[PDB]
Every structure is written in structure tokens, then in C-alpha cells.
């Protein structure tokens, strides 16, 4: 499932942390704000609206159930946007579920617009040229910056199964 | 691996304390098993982050922490 896949790749936090670009994050890779904001009063205010109850603390916490709710909403927003995208959508419809999960994993990490930048990879996947797709994904700066996760994801694209996640 | 104490703590403690512990566990496993991967692991932790490994390291009984090196840098 995507929940077990993204829990592994994104970790699980019940208290805010800041990602490598400085953005406040919580749960399973849930971006609270798309600014590099350190203001806890601002962070708490936004997170309170997102989970449905007043968050206090420096930092405050959410419950495990709130983390799951945030993830389920995040995953649906992404899945909705990946099918509708004019470039990524056609590829998603043409590949099997394992490979859809690989594209959804990338979209969760970098956004659909980020996935849309892999023109050579996506063109190769639509053509069924999995070796060229694999090589294009591992040629990228994304592979150099998050090599463990990108190795797992590109291996799905190459092989068509989920063995790189132990499945 | 699973450790009840480290699991909940890594989910809730201050980020700097948690990432100090995560990096220490990872680097200790690198030095024990694959010392030549030290520079690559350090590079990957800086460019890719370290918080995300809290679940596999402390919350997942089915993940063998010896495999954390390949989790950070890819298949060996």
C-alpha cells in the first residue's frame, strides 16, 4: 500500500520538524506551510485549521490518528492531481500498479510538477523502454540528492514489481 | 527495528535531539559493517535529510537495521 511505502520513505513525526529546505513538516511528510517559516504561532495557527483542533506548544503535537488523517488527505490530493496532469497522467494510465506507485511516490516527494520535469523518463515509460527510463531516473540530480529512495523507486520502474520495498 | 522507547521519543522529541540519535545509529552501523560508505552516507544525510529514517530504525519490527546503509545510499 502507499501508506506503508510512504511511511517508510518519509518517516513518522507527531511533532513539527523542518525539512532540508526549511519547511515545517509533520506526520508522514505533511507540509504544514510552503514557506521556510519558523514562527510557531503561525505554524500552530495553520496546523490547527488543517487538523480541526487547537494546537498549542513550542512545538506542539498531533495524535497518531491526526497524522493518518493528514496523510490520507495528502495522498488523495496527489493521486487526484497525478491523473489529471496533461503529461504525467497519460503515463500513469499506461503502466501497471507497481509503476503507478513509483510515480505517486515521486509526486508525494516533489509534486506532480516536479515529476513532469522527467521528460526522458516519462517518454520512455510510455514507450515501455524500462531500461531507458531507469537510466534517465538515475541520471537525475534527484537521484544524487536522495539516492536511497531514488534507487528504490527507479528499481520499480525498471522491474515492474515492488521487491525493492521488500514486497 | 522496533524499540518502544526510541519509537515514541523519535516521533515527539525536539528535531535536533532526534537527528543526533538517528545519525549516530546510522554512522555506527556504517563503521561496523561498511566503513568505506561513510563519506557517501554523510553526503546523503546532508542532501536528503535524516529525520525520515526514524520509522524504519525504531518503529518497524520487520526492518533489519543492518539494511539502513542501503536505505540511505541505495542497493549495495
Numbering used by the authors:
A (entry chain A): 175 to 341
B (entry chain C): 23 to 98
Task: Reproduce passages from the article.
To that end, we co-crystallized Spackle and gp5 lysozyme and determined the crystal structure of the complex by molecular replacement phasing. Two crystal forms were obtained, in monoclinic and orthorhombic lattice systems, for which the structures were refined to 1.78 and 1.92 Å resolution, respectively. The monoclinic crystal contained two Spackle–gp5 lysozyme complexes in the asymmetric unit, whereas the orthorhombic crystal contained one complex in the asymmetric unit. As expected, the crystal structures show a 1:1 Spackle–gp5 lysozyme complex. In addition, we observed several 4-(2-hydroxyethyl)-1-piperazineethanesulfonic acid (HEPES) molecules bound on the lysozyme surface, including one occupying the oligosaccharide-binding cleft (C-site)20 and another in the peptide-binding groove in the monoclinic crystal structure. The protein structures of the three crystallographically independent complexes were essentially identical to each other, with pairwise backbone room mean square deviations within 0.5 Å. Spackle binds to gp5 lysozyme primarily via three short helices (α1, α4, and α5) located on one side of its flat helical bundle fold. The interface buries a total of 952 Å2 surface area and involves numerous polar contacts. The side chains of a number of basic amino acid residues of gp5 lysozyme, namely Arg181, Arg182, Arg187, and Lys189 from the N-terminal lobe and Arg312, Lys321, and Arg326 from the C-terminal lobe, are involved in intermolecular hydrogen bonds or salt bridges with Spackle. Superposition of Spackle and gp5 lysozyme structures in the complex with their respective unbound state structures shows conformational changes for both proteins upon binding. The partial loss of disulfide linkage may reflect the conformational strain in α1 helix upon lysozyme binding and resulting bond breakage or preferential binding of Spackle in the reduced form during crystallization. These observations suggest that Spackle–gp5 lysozyme interaction is mediated by mutual conformational changes, likely via an induced-fit mechanism.
One of the T4 early gene products produced immediately following the genome injection is gp61.3, also known as Spackle. Spackle, along with another T4 gene product Imm, confers the infected host E. coli with resistance against secondary phage infections—a phenomenon known as “superinfection exclusion”. Our results show that T4 Spackle forms a stoichiometric complex with the lysozyme domain of gp5 and potently inhibits its enzymatic activity, whereas Spackle does not appreciably inhibit the cytoplasmic T4 lysozyme (endolysin, gpe) responsible for cell lysis at the final step of the phage lytic cycle. Crystal structure of the Spackle–gp5 complex shows that the binding of Spackle induces an allosteric conformational change in the gp5 lysozyme active site and partially blocks its oligosaccharide-binding cleft.
